[PDB]
Ligand binder design. Structure first.
Ligand code: NAP
Ligand code: NAP
Ligand code: LJY
Ligand code: LJY
Lengths: 413, 411
């Protein structure tokens, strides 16, 4: 009696995450749930094999079936082109997908009692989202060769008066300059995703900006969030004993470091990249970072780990050496995905399993069975020895055993 | 008694004014004679002068080169109606940078008994930002609807103008903005960062997002490699250190797994302590120093990265016990004097500047500190009164330890 899972769009990936991804399906997922799976290999060979079309096709499956679970993919730089002999430097799959689906990406660390956090006292979860990976990806930048006047202009499409804003008047040398933009359409999406992520998770929501300085730019993020909230989300927030409030980023950081957690943060940063966030990097185990892509309708969810393909470990695997790669984030991609499926289907057996799997993963670590990065968090890297951790299979085997027990006992009721 | 020479001083506001005068009295004036050129950068003095006193303070730093600044009230719509201000005056620190050029760094004083966010960080990590980041150089506006936003360059020459597409709003509006940076700003920023790394004896690293802003940030990066290979390259090799560029993604992840011990030039939009996670995670903003350096090498103005500690000031006003950490403020003075000692080559003053930091540190390593610092070790919930000293007790204990340290030197 396997569980009837329903329609899920799976997306296979590259390197160490592919290798693990399979272990998850075989050892933790398929022995218990029969899915109407809709796989899409997005490993770099096949993306190149199809001219990055398989990426676009997965994005459309996700729209239709409302549930995606994606493995980590190689985004090609120059050296990967030469390494796989690619036809061209294909765009990052994650951006391709999120452009098609609209909506917003939220990351969150998985927190275990026996794993130190930067801030002890952070005990309820911190869930942060950025506006389409950041304001930097919508920047038009160039060098100013010599003296002169840089300006920005609005050209009403109808054809009423132009308006010109002097940016700077370079009077005695060169420099650099750039323009940045955001569409209302897009800010509204960010709003709806954030509010609806908050209702779904049950915590309150904070929008941070720098509207002391960017009065009109960050202003209009605030006013849009406020109009949308006051017009269509307040009653449902009140009903969950939660709220939305805008903060100055200055205020918002000071609070969040003096807090216990349990909130949604809509950061209006310039850079949304995980790899440049000091706190995310500071936990000291990127393998405990989940992500989720929520769309402005509330139905459509795509889940995935926030780390990369772990190329450094992958090269060791190929040469047949020990690896201690952390599967958690990838495991939680499946459980968040499956959980949301269950939400849409009103499928209590799936919801139980999903939660169960998340539960066991933390429990397993808390008993003191874990991968090297987590032991390193406990003891310190120079102090870690081989008998403090399990390799990638030993930890996956352990999670299988503990999952068997959990569900076997849990059945008796 | 040790004559220092000329220093420039700007008296501050609220809790920092009180803490200032105590440092002057107990720590500075009994050990050292000075030619204090003092400006009253309290809010109420500025309003009386129509902000002009801030200018005078700044221009005076030009002549003498050493400044020590007490935290100051930067007005706001409630601070206006609090003092009936003639106008909502601008930030003093800004006016002072604006007038001196220069690049503001920020350090956090560390002790062996005060947990850092990362245990492994056992050396200083000094961060500078390019003129407070490019949000203060931004020009924002609302887009009412469908239409084009174009950024254009009209050469002074008169040669053909250039025009890049920012975005064409097809359906509905949004927002737009453009920011700039003159090359001279960047040369200064780089110069300041090369001088700062040379004095503090640590390697340098510049962070950018040149994988997305290939031109804008790339430009920063070259001016850094150019000026390095040109003017400073072999001076580093002489002091056994090095300069390198790091993609911001790479820099952050390298830092957080390092032992500290480097200068960091952050090319950023927001160079405000308030919004820095890592600075607000230490626990005591009372431990965060900040030092303005100029390109020319000659000019240094020190202060505290924390504000005026208003919540503590209101407790001062009512006779209620306060526990305000003065280290940053002490370090404003030691930085100012250790610099003045290198200008004057005044060895006697140099020793005093290093003496007072070692004392400040030793006191806290010994286990005598303020409430913030106690909270970092135990947790604010677990903190008993017996765990820490109040504003006054901590001073007297430093004053005491300063006296004893100075004595043993003579011998
Ligand atoms: N959406 C995505 O799928 C996504 C996101 C980011 C990057 N990537 C791609 O993945 C490839 C590799 O990128 P990268 O090496 O920069 O990033 P990465 O895969 O996150 O690896 C960086 C380092 O972090 C540690 N780490 C990350 N995940 C871990 C895990 N699950 N368990 C244990 N340790 C872990 C490892 O450090 P130690 O080796 O020191 O243990 C690893 O070398 C690139 O082609 C990149 O474009 C993909
Ligand atoms: N250097 C400058 O010129 C500068 C920099 C920032 C702000 N300001 C100005 O000064 C005011 C800032 O006040 P603010 O309350 O916003 O920020 P703040 O005075 O720097 O600090 C606010 C809180 O931080 C803690 N704190 C700061 N310094 C401390 C110390 N030395 N010892 C112990 N705790 C300390 C206190 O927390 P607890 O209350 O929890 O103990 C305090 O309530 C504003 O009017 C602003 O315009 C000036
Ligand atoms: C509950 O523990 C965590 C939660 C996390 N959530 C994600 C996150 C939080 C976050 C919080 C702030 Cl104040 C600033 C930037 C941030 N960036 C992030 O990506 C990350 C790390 C830990 C730790 N330790
Ligand atoms: C030696 O430990 C410290 C040094 C500090 N230096 C100042 C500073 C560091 C810093 C480091 C990063 Cl990775 C990011 C932003 C940062 N902003 C800062 O203002 C601050 C805190 C601690 C701690 N714990």
């Amino acid at each position: 009696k396997k569980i009837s899972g329903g329609s899920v769009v799976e997306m296979q990936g590259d390197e160490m995450t592919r290798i693990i991804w399979e272990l998850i399906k075989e050892k933790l997922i398929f022995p218990y749930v029969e899915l109407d799976l809709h796989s899409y290999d997005l490993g770099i060979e096949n993306r190149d094999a199809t001219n990055d079309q398989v990426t676009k096709d997965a994005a459309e499956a996700i729209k239709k079936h409302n549930v995606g679970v994606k493995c980590a993919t190689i985004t090609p730089d120059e050296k990967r082109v030469e390494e796989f002999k690619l036809k061209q430097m294909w765009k990052s799959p994650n951006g391709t997908i999120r452009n098609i689906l609209g909506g917003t990406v939220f990351r969150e660390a998985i927190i275990c009692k026996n794993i130190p956090r930067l801030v002890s006292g952070w005990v309820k979860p911190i869930i942060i989202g950025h506006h389409a990976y950041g304001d930097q990806y919508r920047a038009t930048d160039f060098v100013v060769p010599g003296p002169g006047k840089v300006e920005i202009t609005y050209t009403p499409s109808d054809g009423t008066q132009k308006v010109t804003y002097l940016v700077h008047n370079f009077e005695e040398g060169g420099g650099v300059a750039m323009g940045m933009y955001n569409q209302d359409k897009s800010i509204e999406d960010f709003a709806h995703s954030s509010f609806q992520m908050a209702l779904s998770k049950g915590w309150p929501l904070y929008l941070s900006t720098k509207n002391t300085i960017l009065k009109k730019y960050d202003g209009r993020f605030k006013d849009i969030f406020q109009e949308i909230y006051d017009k269509q989300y307040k009653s449902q927030f009140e009903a969950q004993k939660i709220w939305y409030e805008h903060r100055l980023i200055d205020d918002m950081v000071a609070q969040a470091m003096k807090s216990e957690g349990g909130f949604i943060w809509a950061c209006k940063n310039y850079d949304g990249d995980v790899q440049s966030d000091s706190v995310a990097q500071g936990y000291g185990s990127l393998g405990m970072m989940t992500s989720v892509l929520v769309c402005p309708d509330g139905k459509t969810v795509e889940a995935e780990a926030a780390h990369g393909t772990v190329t450094r470990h992958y090269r060791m695997y190929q040469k047949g050496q020990e690896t201690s790669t952390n599967p958690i984030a990838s495991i939680f991609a499946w459980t968040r995905g499956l959980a949301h499926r269950a939400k849409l289907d009103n499928n209590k057996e799936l919801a139980f399993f999903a939660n169960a799997l998340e539960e066991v993963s933390i429990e397993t670590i808390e008993a003191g069975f874990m991968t090297k990065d987590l032991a390193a968090c406990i003891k310190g890297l120079p102090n870690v020895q081989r008998s403090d951790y399990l390799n990638t299979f030993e930890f996956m085997d352990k999670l299988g055993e503990n999952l068997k027990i959990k569900l076997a006992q849990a059945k008796l009721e």
